[PDB]
Design a protein around this ligand. Structure first.
Ligand code: CL
Ligand code: CL
Ligand code: CL
Ligand code: CL
Lengths: 392, 392, 392, 392
């Protein structure tokens, strides 16, 4: 049998976008209220309050009404001005990518770059900051998804704070699926969104903003105002007694309301544990069957995405196509410089359940063996299952 | 009895946002596919095709992934260069508002402004173009929603074309509810969205772009690129064989797919007829009960929104609060200059049905009379019913 | 304009079936669990518990997995045996109809019948019971929907209890929309369902059963067992630790779960008040415009359905067809002996909001005037609105 | 980690009820129309038409408004008269169970019974019919689900027809998942439903009735009439111009409409192929890991359910509890005689995808090994994968 390309697949195991929880999809179907209806104004405020609790924030997070590249570009546009000297940390596609926006807003850019299977070394950061007291803004990506690797953002953020610089963090593919919060890493801007670990639909940005960052952006004549790129316009929009700069994405807010309830009701630590367990089982299976996890070390592998290195000689695009056509299972490609180098399996929200690692392993192994590899698929399943069974 | 502010209303008859069609709300609940899943790639392409058909476009419209203020800003940012001379037409809040974006991108701004219950005279546009042959871009709003009035964009567009200038049209609150299409007004950029007359939730922009406008933007090195404000980056994104600049709003695209199906299936002409008949009945009722339609003349009143002038000594905010608390019926406030001066009843998508005009008239009359007016509410209902019956 | 028969209508104001609440329709879309999954077993038990609370029952109500004619036939089949002498009370289609099932299960049938716009007189019942000590079972309909009239079931039930007979009550179209509960009327069998006042989808029966009724049915060799008509088979099925005689209607149970939450959260007295207010406004409008409420007296008119007498000469079928074709509003026909005599407007669940009485009045009046009547429609709306505005 | 009993599972792989298709679940959420709304009358007619097409029927199938035990009981009540001589075929719980209903309606009952992992031999049916030419009705179950075994109903039906007798077929758990149709087995009553292979929720019966069976039932004065057990009352109900005996399950009909669309759109042959391939892979895996399929031979194993024999000393209930608590995967118990003796994995509608067999094998192996077995789980997965790959 073969799954047609036009027909829906059986299981989507991708690393962004990902399927939303069934309850969230139902929440999307709530009646669309007028945004100035008192019931919507109250809902919006309570959604911001739930995001605040979720992010363990001392102040309100900002919801912006586009998907997280909006938050990222808006942060650069608003926080970085030509007087700033930016240190950009790049260990992957998003880290490197942020430097391009930084350079659009200040000519002064320094970078620490490591190959796209590695993590940024906090000692390298401490040294760079000591050598360059002129540094005023530092940007970092927590989970650089196209590599499935994690940077030590809490240590980095502490170093950056001691230096006296502002920190911009991309936690789009980490928040909700592992222990991380704006104040854990001393973030001045902390960008996340609904459609990775939180299992909500795509199209919103959730942003932690420090009081210090508010003052810098509001002072900056070059910060976007009356613009889709404006963070400053949205400062007070959380309040039931305040207007919306432009019409919010009402249905997405309904979905996010449900997703926040699910997260908080299940308990963040329980949610993080099942992300990590699913990823750990996946990695054990990949290694046991004869494949390699992309990450330079197991310690930096993401608990929300496993990136599997393509064996030299295998056509990675054809591999993913075979996994869908033969088994109905959809994996993520790489992106930019990781495209063709690896395959990604998301473990995010509804797919952060260990049984999906079992499905992923079987489809990935079967596809690989159809490409002429001779993987020990059975051994891989048994190794993944041993991890699940060992979990205390 | 009284409807609590915290609880949902019974009927929302607002002018943006508005309730989506129940079929569309169910469409939002579809499983969220990977955007690079071939089934989603196909779907996205087919949605653009359905958009092209609905908009009667000779080329592909662009879908942008933000609500229509994104399209308006991006159009100004991409089409207006610093050597352009822009003529902005302002008959209300959105028209006037656009001139601020124009001025951002060219210091050369001319304007025709009329009172905010009037429409732009095509003869005034012709006189201005004769006086200023250096004009290269003209911008206009079709339905300036906070006023509930309509500009003669097809007449205006013919004169803009006669002068060899580019036309930017905001048809956000008119497209799908009346006969209007990019071709009809010779628009170079035509901006609309799905959450007014089309009955889908907020969050997307549908933009008609002329081949001439494509050439102008592509040649403009200041036109946004690698930006949420970029139109040019999305040029080829409609195609199943091409990437997305950033992640599309998958669930919104699912809703839009359904909305376009409903519009095309019902028949655009039949859709426009019921919008216009609902508005016509509403206006007849408003006048018969002793209230005044805001519009300076009936000929310029929108078939998609009726604005009713607030009588002297009536608190408009209290009036809307009373209509909801007493009857469970929600109306729109004005915006900017019209805030506090008028009340808006939307006739859009699901609410473009004459029976909703009857509900509206009753709730509006009831709230007015509770504020001390002495309206002939029964006469209002009979006049609106006569309008409906005369069309039967 | 005209609404095609094949296309969906705008507002459904019928008296059974009726639209379900939006939340309930969403609840219908929950994943279908295995019925022996512990989470479903628990859900089922908590649904029975919520029905118990709703019905103010001292013991568990029984949910049967077909629409309420199942409960009615099952009650006759199980409780009535040939030794019984049944007094059937008939003031309408369902009351009379029950006598046919009674006669199937005992040859001994006595009846009190009144014309189908009247209510049963408790004095007539007291007299009949005194004259016939042999009576052992009495059946009564609370709201005989096809007439829109209410019987005094609490007084009747007390008389029946004093006699020492069993009482069977049909409260299908009354429970949830007015003050009524099994123990208010000393019911031995009290049959209701989800899809009238409770705003849940059709296909289940909720049944209050007295301990005395349990003992009579379980003793009866002729009571259905291993049958769709079996009540006795389902006695213990409420418990998470017990099996289901046959597979329950899982999705309907999901919907009922949500409907019970809505009812209990809003508060039963508040729900009943808005049913009554909507009906009261409707009746005021009908009378003021020049039509007649079917009920012999206002005191017996249902707060959950208004039946409007067809003017002699008017084609009632054509009237309903015109109301839908012209205004998109759907009314109920009569049934059996009330078919052609009256039109029904349901005020049930989501349609028990006074603004819908306003819509109903306008469509009914407009349709009537298209049939050549000369109703004072405006006067009717003003009378309905006065009732709403007077409500303290 | 452990999945709480109170919380939802991750994957349900049961044999009835089963999860519905997500499109069907959204279909259940359609607005509930009045059943006499012309749009619903049309829809109901078209659903019966789609049912006729799917069932390859020369006449209209009857939809009854109760889950399929209603169809089975009603078929016995209507087709079997007291002078009929019934031959009941029993190879499991449902087959044996039907004889109890037959005996209710005729005292003349003959039976062929085989062990509950075997199938009925068509030659034994031929021998019995020769021995008892007075036989007038024969009843048989196609897939006796609690055993996961299949009877040769087409062979049996040809011999029943050769003897001039009527055939009643239970195809509740086979229709839509394998090649089977009323015509194929010369059935006079053919009972199925939508909540197995068709992936709609429980609550309806779809019944094929031969013209000969119609004549027999209509002439039977004991066939239920004015009863939820009545088939004859529903004879003309399919028609948009005819009434419904009682209120149809509107929302279920909405779901069925969608389910039939999915089945016809995908292609019945393609649907049957993936059921059979999923079951075949499951059986290969079960055997390879060291477990036994219940069925006496592979040739009689159902392509829609695999039953796995419980090893000596394994608590089957604890096993299912372990599979859910450890892996979030839900299996079916046996029923009656097979309860405690086997575990069932359904391959039905949405779960008839080979990747689910992989999830099933892993959860089943894992739970077995936690109960002290020493299964070759990896060998199991590879055998199931080889089956999938051989069909590719
Ligand atoms: Cl996101
Ligand atoms: Cl919009
Ligand atoms: Cl009901
Ligand atoms: Cl079924």
């Amino acid at each position: 049998m073969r799954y047609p390309e036009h027909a829906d697949p059986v299981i989507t195991l991708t690393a962004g976008p990902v399927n939303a929880y069934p309850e969230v999809l139902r929440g999307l179907g709530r009646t669309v209220l007028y945004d100035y209806d008192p019931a919507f104004q109250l809902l919006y405020e309570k959604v911001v309050d739930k995001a605040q609790k979720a992010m363990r924030l001392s102040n309100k997070p900002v919801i912006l009404h586009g998907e997280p590249v909006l938050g990222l570009e808006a942060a650069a546009a608003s926080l970085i001005s030509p007087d700033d000297v930016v240190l950009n940390l790049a260990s992957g596609v998003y880290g490197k990518g942020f430097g391009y926006w930084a350079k659009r807003y200040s000519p002064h850019l320094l970078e620490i770059e490591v190959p796209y299977n590695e993590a940024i070394d906090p000692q390298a950061v401490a040294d760079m900051l000591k050598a360059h007291p002129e540094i005023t803004v530092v940007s970092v990506c927590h989970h650089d998804t196209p590599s499935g690797t994690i940077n030590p953002i809490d240590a980095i953020g502490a170093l950056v704070s001691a230096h006296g610089a502002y920190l911009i963090v991309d936690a789009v593919s980490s928040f909700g699926g592992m222990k991380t919060h704006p104040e854990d890493c001393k973030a001045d801007i902390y960008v996340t969104g609904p459609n990775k670990c939180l299992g909500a639909p795509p199209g919103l940005t959730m942003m932690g903003v420090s009081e210090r960052a508010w003052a810098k952006m509001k002072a900056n004549p070059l910060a976007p105002r009356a613009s889709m790129l404006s963070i400053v316009d949205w400062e007070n929009a959380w309040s039931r007694d305040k207007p919306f700069p432009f019409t919010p994405s009402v249905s997405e807010i309904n979905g996010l309301d449900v997703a926040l309830d699910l997260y908080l009701n299940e308990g963040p630590e329980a949610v993080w544990a099942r992300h990590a367990l699913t990823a750990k089982a996946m990695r054990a299976g990949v290694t046991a069957m004869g494949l390699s996890v992309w990450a330079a070390s197991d310690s930096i592998a993401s608990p929300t995405t496993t990136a599997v290195r393509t064996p030299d000689g295998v056509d990675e695009k054809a591999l993913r196509q075979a996994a869908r056509a033969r088994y109905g299972v959809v994996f993520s490609s790489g992106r930019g410089e990781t495209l063709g180098k690896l395959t990604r399996i998301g473990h995010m929200g509804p797919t952060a359940q260990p049984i999906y690692a079992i499905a992923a392993l079987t489809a990935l192994g079967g596809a690989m063996n159809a490409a002429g590899r001779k993987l020990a698929i059975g051994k891989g399943i048994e190794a993944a299952l041993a991890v699940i069974d060992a979990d205390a």
